[PDB]
Ligand binder design. Structure first.
Ligand SMILES: *[C@@H]1O[C@H](CO)[C@@H](O[C@@H]2O[C@H](CO)[C@@H](O)[C@H](O)[C@H]2NC(C)=O)[C@H](O)[C@H]1NC(C)=O
Ligand SMILES: *[C@@H]1O[C@H](CO)[C@@H](O[C@@H]2O[C@H](CO)[C@@H](O)[C@H](O)[C@H]2NC(C)=O)[C@H](O)[C@H]1NC(C)=O
Ligand SMILES: *[C@@H]1O[C@H](CO)[C@@H](O[C@@H]2O[C@H](CO)[C@@H](O)[C@H](O)[C@H]2NC(C)=O)[C@H](O)[C@H]1NC(C)=O
Ligand SMILES: *[C@@H]1O[C@H](CO)[C@@H](O[C@@H]2O[C@H](CO)[C@@H](O)[C@H](O)[C@H]2NC(C)=O)[C@H](O)[C@H]1NC(C)=O
Ligand SMILES: *[C@@H]1O[C@H](CO)[C@@H](O[C@@H]2O[C@H](CO)[C@@H](O)[C@H](O)[C@H]2NC(C)=O)[C@H](O)[C@H]1NC(C)=O
Ligand SMILES: *[C@@H]1O[C@H](CO)[C@@H](O)[C@H](O)[C@H]1NC(C)=O
Ligand SMILES: [Zn+2]
Lengths: 100, 450, 50
């Protein structure tokens, strides 16, 4: 989870435009300091404060992870139209040759 | 008072901790980069001479009462020493705990299964069963491997795990924890900062709450993979059921990566690989590291230090000097950072270079902290910076700039889907397995499951 | 013929209490049977080979 929060808070500081999965941090010193002043803390601070010093929040978030996979999500919702999305927990591979 | 005394004690501690740590790490490095029976015992001598100093200094510090200090960077270090660990256990119990741990580890390492038709060819797990489970495409062979591992080896570990939970629960309750799971969750706890607190009970709610937004995407992934496996194994997979557990790429289903060949969305368009363009431009395992360092220095972080270039093992030694080179970074102390890895000129090493150098760049940043306050903010922070450094360096907009991937290369919106699906098979495919496993273990370290 | 010969050469038996240490015939079972003086150990070797 952190792996994506970090990134979504970084190229949002490198002024990215396109989808998340294309952002590159290179050549953006203003996105270096924003990361550097979290690295030089070690364990001398609560991890909540350290996360605050980059993301701007205090908790695990799943929204950046979902924003990373948005194109794939739409393409899948398209490819899964003629199918059953979900599963049933009663079928089993050996249930048709069992005797009760 | 009590404060000045504690501060002086930590001061006196740091010197010896630093020096002994340096020498022990030097021993372990010299052993790792040079596998010689000479160095084994030497590394063991250094290791024990560090372990003993740690135990002694820990008991010598059990006297300072905790809830009297107000300096946070002092309470933080003291809390790391007073941690009793497994000492509080009785003597004979601690010895049986160690015996159990070593037995389980060596059963896993040396267990082996063998054919029903030729009982004189047995396979270990690492080379031989992992290979079947990763490569094969035969239903019955996969089922045989999957079942034999769990029947020949998993049945030996039942009686041992039963005793392991009891002893660990004792060790945990003798340190004012509810159970062992509550002891493990104690890495995310924050205490007394007025706005940033965090309790060991909140972690459960946070992961159960984050795992709700993932099910909508994980079940579309699941449905797509099932509809694609219903073509490689016809008649074996119900179109509305679950997926049989032995057809998931590896032995436990932890990662879904090895399903790529079966489920690639646009099978004719190729991936982005620059191995060729690297050999053609004459790249050895020394230019890739200057490239990584240049990438890092672009963003603002500092350079590398000479000792890194001198002492490092960037390349495989090749000759009789053997050295296990699972890629790693090392922070020996006092200013000696160095990586050890046998770089082959491919792409999947151009990435591990960035990963490991990100580890290093983390370490060089907090190197001005007290010896016990040199780690990630918690346990999940360290690999999560290696990951983002490795993730930003594999994008065509970067490769196009560093020289590879000749400029007239248009990325189609189909290779983008190819890449995102290769990514989601290891990131998203593994979140439910992780969640389910830790949930089960938290519940059995509570007697919640008889 | 080759199957029988190689079964004899590479067959191995292993302990009932530690199934991860198997012994071949030439070094390891011949040694037990030639040196040991324990009734139960000899019986175990004799029976497991056959
Ligand atoms: C690997 O370790 C061996 C010993 O464990 C090293 O051998 C020593 O090498 C130095 C210099 O080459 C000699 O002065 C010693 O006499 C050697 N000792 C022995 C027992 O042979 C060897 O040098 C190490 N490899 C490298 C590359 O440093
Ligand atoms: C906690 O104690 C440390 C001492 O280890 C204090 O840090 C010192 O602060 C003074 C004040 O300027 C500096 O001159 C020293 O160089 C600092 N020492 C170190 C090792 O950094 C710290 O101030 C104390 N905490 C609080 C909140 O006062
Ligand atoms: C660590 O373990 C010891 C006992 O193994 C705990 O008990 C203290 O031990 C010291 C040893 O000299 C005594 O002086 C104290 O009186 C003991 N305290 C109590 C309440 O019995 C010690 O509390 C443990 N520390 C932690 C942090 O759990
Ligand atoms: C970061 O910026 C520098 C300069 O702003 C880029 O370096 C130039 O790159 C172009 C094409 O790659 C070359 O034609 C120039 O000669 C380069 N100039 C220098 C001084 O190196 C660099 O490519 C940028 N990095 C990325 C990843 O785009
Ligand atoms: C990649 O882009 C192409 C070009 O837009 C997409 O192809 C078009 O998709 C739209 C969406 O329904 C159709 O209306 C057009 O008829 C398509 N054009 C052609 C020539 O077939 C394509 O769909 C995109 N890739 C994916 C995976 O959607
Ligand atoms: C970093 O090292 C390169 C050579 O490897 C050098 O050209 C550059 O000046 C160094 N950085 C700084 C800030 O001096
Ligand atoms: Zn790593």
């Amino acid at each position: 989870l952190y792996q994506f929060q970090f990134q979504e808070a970084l190229c949002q500081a490198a002024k990215h435009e396109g989808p998340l999965h294309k952002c590159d941090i290179s050549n953006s010193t203003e996105a270096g300091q924003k990361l550097f002043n979290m690295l030089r803390l070690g364990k001398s601070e609560p991890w909540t404060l350290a996360l605050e010093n980059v993301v701007g929040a205090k908790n695990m978030n799943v929204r950046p992870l979902l924003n990373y996979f948005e194109p794939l999500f739409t393409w899948l919702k398209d490819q899964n139209k003629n199918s059953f999305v979900g599963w049933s927990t009663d079928w089993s591979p050996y249930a048709d040759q069992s005797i009760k | 008072t009590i404060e000045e005394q504690a501060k002086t004690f930590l001061d006196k501690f740091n010197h010896e901790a630093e020096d002994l740590f340096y020498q022990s790490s030097l021993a372990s490095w010299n052993y790792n980069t040079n596998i010689t029976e000479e160095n084994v015992q030497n590394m063991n001598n250094a290791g024990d001479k560090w372990s003993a100093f740690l135990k002694e200094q820990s008991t010598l510090a059990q006297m300072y009462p905790l809830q009297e200090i107000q300096n946070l960077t002092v309470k933080l270090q003291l809390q790391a020493l007073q941690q009793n660990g497994s000492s509080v256990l009785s003597e004979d119990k601690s010895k049986r705990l160690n015996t159990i741990l070593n037995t389980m580890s060596t059963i896993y390492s040396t267990g082996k299964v063998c054919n029903p038709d030729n009982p004189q060819e047995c396979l270990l797990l690492e080379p031989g069963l992992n290979e079947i489970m990763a490569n094969s495409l035969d239903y019955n062979e996969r089922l045989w491997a999957w079942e034999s591992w769990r029947s020949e080896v998993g049945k030996q570990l039942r009686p041992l795990y039963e005793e392991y939970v009891v002893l660990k629960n004792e060790m945990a309750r003798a340190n004012h924890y509810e159970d062992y799971g509550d002891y493990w969750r104690g890495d995310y706890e924050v205490n007394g900062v007025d706005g940033y607190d965090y309790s060991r009970g909140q972690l459960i709610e946070d992961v159960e709450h984050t795992f709700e937004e993932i099910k909508p995407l994980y079940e579309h992934l699941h449905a797509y993979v099932r509809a694609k496996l219903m073509n490689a194994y016809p008649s074996y997979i119900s179109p509305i059921g679950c997926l049989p557990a032995h057809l998931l790429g590896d032995m436990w289903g932890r990662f879904w990566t090895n399903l790529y060949s079966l489920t690639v969305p646009f099978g004719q368009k190729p991936n982005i690989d620059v191995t060729d363009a690297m050999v053609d431009q004459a790249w050895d395992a020394q230019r890739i590291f200057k490239e990584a360092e240049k990438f890092f220095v672009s963003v603002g972080l500092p350079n590398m230090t000479q000792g890194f270039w001198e002492n490092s093992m960037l390349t495989d030694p090749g000759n009789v000097q053997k050295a296990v080179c699972h890629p790693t970074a090392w922070d020996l102390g006092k200013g000696d950072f160095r990586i050890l890895m046998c770089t082959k000129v491919t792409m999947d090493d151009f990435l591990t270079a960035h990963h490991e150098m990100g580890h290093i760049q983390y370490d060089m940043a907090y190197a001005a902290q007290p010896f016990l306050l040199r780690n990630g903010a918690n346990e999940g922070f360290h690999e999560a910076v290696g990951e983002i450094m490795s993730l930003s360096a594999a994008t065509p907009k970067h490769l196009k700039s560093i020289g590879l991937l000749s400029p007239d290369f248009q990325e189609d919106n189909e290779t983008e889907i190819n890449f995102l699906l290769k990514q989601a098979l290891t990131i998203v495919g593994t979140l439910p397995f992780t969640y389910m496993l830790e949930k089960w273990r938290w519940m059995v370290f509570k007697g919640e499951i008889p």
